[PDB]
Design a protein around this ligand. Structure first.
Ligand code: HEM
Ligand code: HEM
Ligand code: HEM
Ligand code: HEM
Ligand code: HEM
Lengths: 238, 238, 236, 236, 237
């Protein structure tokens, strides 16, 4: 019910955690693993009041990673507890952590200075689909970007928004402000049924003048499929 | 029969996976190894209906690698399943991944604006030989490249193509558009019986003005021999 | 404790550790005895150094524990850290970070206008169990070429944009050149991260930010809880 | 053999290996049997390739042994190297870098003065068990942008600075572009490392050096000796 | 003699760092104490051709426990010693963590300095017991080597000028390392007061030479100087 209270509202932290599965996990008998999966489900369900957790299968799409959590929380302290709890699970004890990025979502900064025609197009909701592809791209702006005045950056971001608009219907997007919580300024999240559209989306943004201000683009670029936690861990049950 | 329908048609994703074999693999008794090899062979044959898998021996040609998969599929979802099954396999659980790159094939962008004399020579298929050397080079363009207009880049790529033409008869080439699926913009793939030609090919392309725009060239530069999957896995028995 | 967190000439070390998998393969009572060994080690050193504990687990990747050790002589800090890694607990820890930084009298403060000076004597965030952020910084070559005046001016614009955060963000600077691969170690306590997030974005606008060659890497983030509260979470 | 160390069209492969900890857990007798397997494999391949060995243990970090393998085709080098790492000894070896480079007939020497051409025909240093250095090199985009005359002139300046070291430093160059991540592989033999050192700083003065985008990384240093004596030293 | 390696030129200097495995603590204490005794002798057995000094980097430098500063007239001898050491039972529980060689030479630019500066330079420095020790590798940019002998000489005089007030509290040593590894220089320092050593470096960050340092540190090795036995004693129980 309060699902969207975290996915859209501001002041909401957003955390990306990646995990890789150890070798010993398959030494466990199939029965012992199926049980282990249930412990996680409950931990998530027990935490379903304070946070929100969505899972993605990165195995075979992203290098050196199997599982990613997108955890929403009113405070990062709560996410700290959950991740510690998750890694304390018998399943989690057979997981080696592989990267962690936090980012708080905020109300738009440059959109207000856009054309009223452009503002409208942005209210085109996007792509709402079941089990879509998911992409995560961290970004760091160069010192030059921050030196610019508010009007200049606003105009640059209008050029940014303009090139992306014809992909709004097929590519969902969300932005996390990450500066000061790690080594990145932004975390970008995307959902798509057609990866070819998302690709064309990116080269289209390679055309704008904004791209040259990106000191860091990707590294790592997390690609994966979106699916309920049960089916992912089920694939780990064999 | 259904084979060439993927290697030439557009919309076909192409995935490159590299693996290295652990030390613990040789601690395993031979009997355990022969079964592990057998588990892999059938699984590949089991997946021969939805995708295409070719194997390459990087052992002794590429550092920290023994095996490379060139997997073609209309959807990355299928490739994700295959790779996940493969790395869960008893052989695969003794494999460490060493890079993973996706790239969708596309309809040529600059060829249409070429001289008709150049277009024709490009339609020359190339040299078809058995068990050739294979090189894979990922490439990332600098921010300047994407800033240029359609005419400048086109002229640059004609200068590119021009230097490459005398190698068409001895070097097969194919290009995958990779931006947004990982940390690279392109994936280049080559087959040749003559490595000395491939070398001369590259320095010839080092002279052109396009080359200076490659922020990343190689890293890693994958070299290997092309051969059936059985023969590679055969070497891990004994 | 005030002698070490305030005075100059007091070194500050930042040790980061991550726990092994096979630590959880150890029987539950062994972890208890292990934890009990560490407290006695810190206690025997309390008369020479000051050890503060942090919990990076679930906030800072490839990290579980962080120490902030203060000592007027770095030798004392060396004996301790080798001993901690010698302890049964420490033999199951892969250290992944170690930064030293001495404290010194302010360089560019006296040059500042005294309106700003008085605002720097203003208390600051006095919180309990707050978030903690450690950022290492390396200046470029151009920075050190600039004369004192040109640099003192740049730190004025620096101190300026930071003033609205002084009450919600605690700060401490460690001079770290020639002890590791960074020039400065910045340490911050705060109950509000969005506040601290603002402080950085605000500081990104000054021209002094241009002269930061290495910014972050790694950017450590965790909660500042007492030692026992972190070690009790380990035995389970 | 000498038809391979000098003729053009000859591929040259550099393989580095590090010895595991588990190898020394093995009793001495178990190793000697393993050593014997390698000797035969080399002799079995002595028809299609040529193999020279180097002791990097204690001179280059994270390395004990290096192979310099000459062959007209890399496939043969591939078979040998794949077989070698399958050897009982090779199953206790972790691979540590691999660089190929085909030898070709000189490009710029022809445009040199005959006074310089002659001095280059001075064979070099022939010594027993000399030091050996291997340096991979990548040229910047600017170098390849130059037309044929400047590079020719630049390499004449290169050759000029190197001449007083010909009698004490043997050298050979491999064209490596397209087979890995480097453009060239340089190989040197010298009884006097101090000579080789003075040689390198002498070449740091020329205008060519600035066009070297990548210089070394890794820089392989080692001693040259028969394969038997190296492997024997890995015994007991 | 004893002194022929710490001052003379043509003497190679090698820096080897090692980290201690986890399996080392699986061994019973006495078995380790014996291993310590084995190492002591190997050093003394080699005490004729080379010189070995040891440093504790455990808890001061990341990912390192022990460092050797080995001086030898030939690198071949140092190669043998390290191979024996890493083959030693203690050494089989050691993982190597970086290796840099550098030959000491007679000064290149000092001759062109004022004798007022030369005199102050003849002050050897501070000889103290168990001082801190710092190792900083350095690589100069291509621009530096493009400069003529006079400019570089003047730049190095500016370097020397800034360092002088630290001569009495900071010992300095320079190794010419180009061609033996991936660095051009290796710098070694001893001081009882690290606070002095810090001020020394930012003072040297002001000069125009510093911008020519393509690589400065990476890694920057810090540690304590002490006899090999007392260091190894800590690796026993
Ligand atoms: C349909 C796709 C997209 C749309 C509609 C879009 C639109 C926008 C808009 C309106 C903003 C302003 C938000 C604000 O006021 O702070 C923004 C910010 C941003 N976007 Fe996107 N964008 C899209 C795709 C992308 C992609 C593909 C990337 C990176 C791979 C990206 C990275 C960023 C970053 C880093 C910012 C913050 C810029 C800054 O404030 O410095 N966006 N985008
Ligand atoms: C050997 C024969 C080769 C031929 C016939 C050839 C031809 C071409 C042609 C016609 C294009 C235009 C693509 C389009 O129109 O959309 C192209 C693109 C490209 N080629 Fe090649 N090429 C060859 C070798 C190579 C090599 C050796 C490399 C790199 C080592 C390379 C790297 C690339 C890259 C990165 C592009 C992407 C163009 C872009 O950035 O937009 N090619 N090639
Ligand atoms: C409430 C927040 C902050 C306050 C009140 C503050 C204030 C100051 C002041 C007054 C100085 C001058 C030191 C002196 O005179 O010796 C200084 C130095 C410095 N600060 Fe901050 N600052 C704040 C936040 C930050 C942050 C967030 C960072 C980095 C992410 C930072 C990095 C530095 C650095 C690198 C220096 C020394 C630069 C140099 O000497 O070259 N500060 N700060
Ligand atoms: C006694 C010492 C040396 C001699 C006699 C020597 C001589 C030569 C000559 C004559 C050439 C040009 C041959 C041709 O392509 O026609 C050459 C090429 C080259 N040398 Fe050396 N050289 C010496 C030292 C070095 C060293 C120390 C290095 C690097 C560490 C080096 C790196 C190279 C490279 C990268 C090229 C080819 C560059 C290009 O073709 O773009 N050389 N050498
Ligand atoms: C502490 C007292 C120091 C003194 C008295 C001193 C003095 C000198 C002198 C006289 C030379 C000339 C060498 C020659 O003639 O060949 C020299 C070279 C050099 N020193 Fe120092 N120095 C000191 C500290 C340092 C420090 C702290 C560093 C680096 C962190 C350093 C790095 C270097 C380098 C890289 C060179 C060789 C530069 C080149 O030839 O390109 N020195 N030093």
């Amino acid at each position: 019910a309060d699902r969207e209270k975290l996915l859209t509202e501001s002041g909401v932290y957003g955390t990306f955690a990646t995990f890789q599965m150890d070798h010993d996990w398959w030494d466990l008998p199939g029965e012992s693993r199926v049980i282990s999966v249930a412990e996680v489900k409950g931990l998530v369900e027990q935490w379903s009041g304070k946070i929100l957790v969505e899972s993605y299968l990165l195995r075979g799409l992203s290098d050196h990673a199997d599982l990613m959590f997108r955890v929403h929380a009113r405070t990062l302290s709560d996410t700290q507890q959950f991740l510690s709890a998750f890694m304390g699970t018998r399943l989690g004890r057979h997981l080696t952590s592989g990267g962690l990025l936090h980012g708080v979502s905020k109300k738009p900064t440059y959109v207000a200075g856009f054309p009223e025609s452009m503002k409208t197009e942005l209210q085109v909701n996007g792509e709402s689909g079941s089990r879509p592809y998911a992409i995560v791209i961290p970004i760091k702006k160069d010192a030059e970007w921050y030196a610019l005045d508010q009007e200049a950056r606003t105009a640059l971001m209008q050029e940014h928004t303009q090139a992306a608009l014809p992909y709004l219907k097929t590519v969902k997007q969300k932005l996390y402000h990450s500066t000061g919580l790690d080594d990145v300024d932004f975390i970008t999240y995307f959902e798509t049924e057609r990866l070819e559209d998302f690709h064309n989306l990116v080269r289209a943004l390679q055309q704008v003048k904004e791209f040259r201000h990106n000191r860091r683009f990707g590294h790592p670029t997390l690609l994966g499929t979106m699916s309920p936690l049960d089916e992912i861990l089920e694939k780990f049950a064999q």
